[model samples]
Target chain A: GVSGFQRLQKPVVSQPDFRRQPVSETMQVYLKQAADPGRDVGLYWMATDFENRRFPGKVSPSGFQKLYRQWRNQTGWDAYVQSCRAIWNDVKYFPIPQSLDDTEDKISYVDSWMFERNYGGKRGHEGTDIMAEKNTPGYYPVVSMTDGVVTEKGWLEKGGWRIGITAPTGAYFYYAHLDSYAELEKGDPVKAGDLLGYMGDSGYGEEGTTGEFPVHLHLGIYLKEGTEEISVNPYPVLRYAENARIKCVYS
Target chain B: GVSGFQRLQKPVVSQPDFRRQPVSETMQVYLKQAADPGRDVGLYWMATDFENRRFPGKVSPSGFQKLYRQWRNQTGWDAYVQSCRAIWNDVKYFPIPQSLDDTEDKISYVDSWMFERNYGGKRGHEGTDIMAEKNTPGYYPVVSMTDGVVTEKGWLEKGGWRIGITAPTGAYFYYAHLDSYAELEKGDPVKAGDLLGYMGDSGYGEEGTTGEFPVHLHLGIYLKEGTEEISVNPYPVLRYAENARIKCVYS
Candidate 1:
């Protein structure tokens, strides 16, 4: 048995190879080949094996196929694969809606969790940051990635114009650093791909503040266990959900 | 070692008799009687003993004094007394400010943690609800009881307008069902007696929502262990801090 202190140390799943959209795309291909929704794909498990050894490059196709053939019908990967599935099931769309002008409005992000944050006070960055190429607040529209009830909506000192949603699976979706919010309030039901707000630089000071830093969306996900709310890294979750990105138009 | 699920069950210190203002008043008298800051006060430990055996009524002064002589110089009660002191040191002012018209703005609360909550799906209420006698929004002023940073501010599905403050002690003080906020933002530093907002009935619905329940303040205190935030009952803490209540005038 582990203490609450010990449990929080392991809140997030081990790294799975959801780098960019390749892992999710590979999942689709494997699902089709298996022809069974109940079947487990060995992608996340094998990715974990590679990640543990700090494998320098991507897992080769032949190596992956061999591993899958050997373990696809086995129960060894059931727990890890199911954990990944739970997160994937809770998300339906990408946070930054895809648009026709996506090529021009380029966005980029990196797995920088636990990085040093120096503003206000020293702390580790807990969420994934999605940076925009334009560096313009309100240029990119932010949308919900899951069907959930709005649990929090308002101005935060560091998050600035943030909104928090709690999905049915009890996953908390936090979108921060927004320029403006839609006419939504707490308790409102929001579906995936629904417009939430726009990206911005709106925290680290008093209300109505902006431009202390570049425009970006800090995405966070939390899970409530007993009386505790534990945060899990959103990088891999974002990579998988990006495949379901939707189109939105704005002049 | 216990699992996180098992550890969460013991987030709070066991109950101490801080009913209304009596327990704190007794503490002051006891402190003076001992005439030593280094001396131990057996109030919290004896209260716990009484609480556990379901001791009828209150422990008499004679009984308390006897327990004090026997255990005041003992090490057995050190851990429990230290835990209580930790919470006491973090708080300086009461949540509701003492004002000139205190006769009119009567407030009351009970140990209602984990009670049934039907709205926003069936869940247990996780905080102490402070109800106003006047039943009017913005009638009573809400103040911070500890010096901390503003961590959360905004509307909540079940909490309406809410604010969360994190003391340097790592205790998260959550005040919900607010009418409005003071000129504060995320990361803003607050003093013990600083105004947070006004008490109101502003939850159970959408933005600008009011009157889902009677005007009240939901006070929640949380401790962060690892990545988890566990809630503790605020009733006793509120009673203990009432001794330091400060007066605030509102128009």
Candidate 2:
């Protein structure tokens, strides 16, 4: 009687756990399917109906499919897809321009969204940290990932020498921890592969502070929802752009 | 009968001509009422039931009231009032800081929204131009009118040196034609009356170009409508902010 048949009482509305699967994982699968030669898989179908046929021995696809349907109803899936495509369409080159020197510059990052951070206070990271191969500032030139207007430029206590570009499609691309900036200022229009600045370790303190961490570029992608800027996992987008990197050639 | 009784064919849906009476005049009266000692009016009632009693000898207040009701239904009047009030609440001081030196700095502007502009192309002005008493650059210190994030910074072909701030309430405050910048960057939060830069005539050409027009601040206020930004007349807001001017005295 105390328990009052709690197990039998089902919720009138089933809330979808959107965070059940990280966006990075879903985006990775989506990108893989897009690049497939046959292009047999549709994102909706893959997430809903064809899941059982596609992944034979994998964990229960029904669970994910159920969640996907709920999520689609909660937030229009088409709009979400369009938002991702907006960034993809704007991308003309990867962020790091190919080094002209024999410095063997390489940049790498995993799906680091929601990674733990504890500088000012404990918080989850909202961006991907692309670590530089060289442990030096100004060694790797960072270029813009897309054609956009420089909406923001300058220093921040956490971001250091950061720049924000608003693409024509309304995605706010944030490039942080730069050693220095190029001639570009706010409102300056830049094409894809335009030189923005160089990678560095420039935040975690006051103005002009540096070297608190390793040299890296913190890339963040944000979309405006009402007055809030909602960040999405950029790992898949980065990998997609990697295929079309701009070569810093001197021939 | 050749026109086939066109006069009788009233629109099924009466489209609200929002531009019939400029926002500047409407906001002015609204401000006057709010500052009134009696507190005798609400914006809704004034635009609805109290129109006949409120205006003694005005030019058909009913016409404006009718337009106001149609506009209220179409675009929502409360949200519009909230947008205006958002800026008002952020205003601790005016845009121009009082001069410290012997220089007398006076600023002026009219309700110039939709005023014709014939430069490169003919278009109606969507902002208020606060012309300075002196036609010299770097003479007057221009400050922020609202506590906001520096969402945009840099130069534009038309605006010259410009900066944009997005207030917490989602109103975009655009300040253009500056002599130079302060240490502030994009994403930096600024308080009202914080120094942004000095006034200047810095447009109509390339970077570093100046003196094509008189030195003045071309102030624009914008609110986002879906993917677009619709600008409203800023003259009334400027006038309202003038009453709370911040002094630049070091004493």
Candidate 3:
């Protein structure tokens, strides 16, 4: 009875735990299937050619990274790759707490990379949705993954209550579908683990509409190297962060 | 004086003190003449413009700022303008040293912000020139005006011997010309007043070509806010930094 099951107007939705397999393990899963060198496996697909570029058979993780480096050449491949590694380790909290977890408590999500969305036009999904575990509004606290400036904070018809953080390298980390925001303003400097807001499924139509989908945190990481900007699959990084989760005051 | 001047073994011409007017004052000057306001500025004008926007007429500095803010909406105007301001003040050294100064020792050029150039085919000049007062190369040391990472350290057909520095705010400060470069490589983080190279006449026909013009520092400041990028007038910022010039041991 104490469980927040009553918090949901209906039954909780179930999602596959892609995070359980762990990204460090999955890169290899994609790589083992890759044919040869240079062709590209799905592991590091930059989300640009994903709609039409499905896994393309099986590939190995080593081949996946090699192709990713060559594909993301505009930005220093090392910097781009290292940036993901850095943020994966840099993030200290998992947005949700294990204290809030139960045998039924899992941050359910799919490998939704490339899933279709139409509001911003038919575009592939560029992030992972951590289905809000508690099914209760404001149950999970969102925090900064690294020190950065709050470059953008507002609502989007698609992102709902979104906040864009400009990381030290000027890469942008995006968090959306926030249940509510803390007292933060744009351009404000933030540190790792700083509270940004709570999780909720609050986007789809207008500024405040919700319930279109189960509550979730739509998180994304974007790299801008020169003229090209591509969103890497955040699922790996998400699972990676989940493993290194710092167990915050709330977490 | 077997300076790089002889390396060119060709005729050398002279220009005037456009870099003498720092960018802070340049903005004000642009703003001051900007009377009627709110169309666009040619800025003779700030290359800070897009394809066709001309400087509106004369107006107050505050009013001018507000208009500039509106005009450069693509960039984070407040941060962009502030970044320029901070660089103007933050940089304690003049590109050229004061001890090296004589009535004749001045980097001269003109307000050739959009002047015609045939290399890119009737393309506009995006920056100003500080004609090395020391017609001879090696004497004019090319030092960084602020601390930054050597985002780009290479030559360009158009840019010549250029070093692109990505300042803390992610603004790019481009310095080109050069008889030679320091030991730094691309991606090297450097401090203000650190040597980048020596100024000379470089670039025109190809990579190693030189002496197309007088030896000068063709400095460019580029801002990439979101997707829009435009070079602002460097003349004023150069002037401002000149005033704050830190006389090096050699200076």
Candidate 4:
């Protein structure tokens, strides 16, 4: 069963060591100015030069805040992510349905953490889901957001065929939902562009289940704050990959 | 000429020194986490329980921020100022137009701070204007925002019939374009809600002019940061006053 369409050791490069590119004091300013315990941390980081190594002229403290909210409302994470898109310079997967052939639709999301979901009570939605443009599962190819080993894989009722990669940055990159898996498994090493699986709607029900809603990839990023792995909004990081959407090569 | 309005002997209470009310360590965490420069300082100050000698539930470093931008837009100062509003305890004068009267029209602004006019060059509008609800001058009564002495009063070509008060909080309050002055003059000490003057449209072109635009009060608040006199937004402060429109007794 595992001998089918698995492409391993296929020349996908790994992510860069961001630790070596230490976050400057300048970045620390905006990062501190960002929201605490909320979605803005990512928005603040997303509107930065960290991804590109070139700090574009940012708005005033209040000004940046004003625009960041607008971006949250209008552009999803794509607007500013494209602005500082260098985040995915090493990402191997397009993370969405990309085609040298199919010119169909585009993806989008909202700042929806304040929303209430199924848990017998109200809880915030931690990660941002990267939906397939046409709601077609297996239409988009899911790929790695960072270079790391899959520390966890397989389906949970909540995540559904998800994979987790622990990057050297000490941040965890989580990709959830799938039509099928690539040649990788739990504990397998992968790079940013390496194919992980196909986008699918397989969540909130059970393992390998489908049709809960639409087909999309729910990407969750967690940072270690003390002992807690808190999920920061992945929208801002998406800005980086969105800018470099051209980096991904279709199979 | 100054003797008639010189109500210097009027019994008015002074401001309760806020320094006696120190901020808490919990708040210190959020303050340090805020942006390095601009806007939030006053907001941070205003949101505190300084008058009550306690720390009220403050918005998280990011929470206060997400809401602050809104105060700036809806209230004035566009956003930062509103963040400080809830902090102001018993503010009379609603600071702009109040519903305490005739079926007057309502006031509004266009965030025209970036727009250019006058002086033969395009310059940013430093403060937001509270236009008269009914487009009629003398419809809105102006009052002091804090306990202060009338520091400056005169006819400037740009700011007609403007009056300035230096508050004990070390904040300088500026009110401009008056239809008439109150029974108060320069050097007269006044407390919060002391009648200052009447709001009017009296700037642009001459000393005492109207119809240049709708009748409005241009409110500006300044702080002496080290050596610089920074004009922080007054909007948020106004929002606090706006929330509870009370304790006002017109002259």
Residue B190 in model 3: shift from native, Å? 1.5
Looking at model 3, residue B71 earns an lDDT score of 40
Which regions in candidate 3 have their CA more than 4 angstroms from the true location? A1-251, B1-90, B100-104, B114-125, B249-251
What's the TM-score of chain B for every model shown? 0.69, 0.71, 0.62, 0.58
Estimate every model's Cα lDDT from 0 to 1. Answer: 0.62, 0.60, 0.55, 0.52
For lDDT, candidate 1 versus 4, the one ahead is 1
Clashes of 3: 33
Measured with C-alpha atoms, the lDDT of residue A115 in candidate 2 is 23
Q: What is the lDDT of residue A137 in candidate 2?
A: 90
Candidate 2, lDDT over the whole model = 0.60
Full candidate order by TM-score, most accurate first = 2, 1, 3, 4
Better of 3 and 4 by TM-score: 3
DockQ of model 4, rounded to 2 decimals = 0.01
| lDDT minimum window of 10 residues, candidate 4 chain B | B4-13
For model 4, residues B203-244, the per-residue Cα lDDT tens digits are 767777765544678877655535655554454345334443
DockQ for all models, in order?
A: 0.01, 0.01, 0.01, 0.01
Q: What is the lDDT of residue A121 in candidate 3?
A: 35
Tell me the deviation in Å of residue B146 in model 4.
48
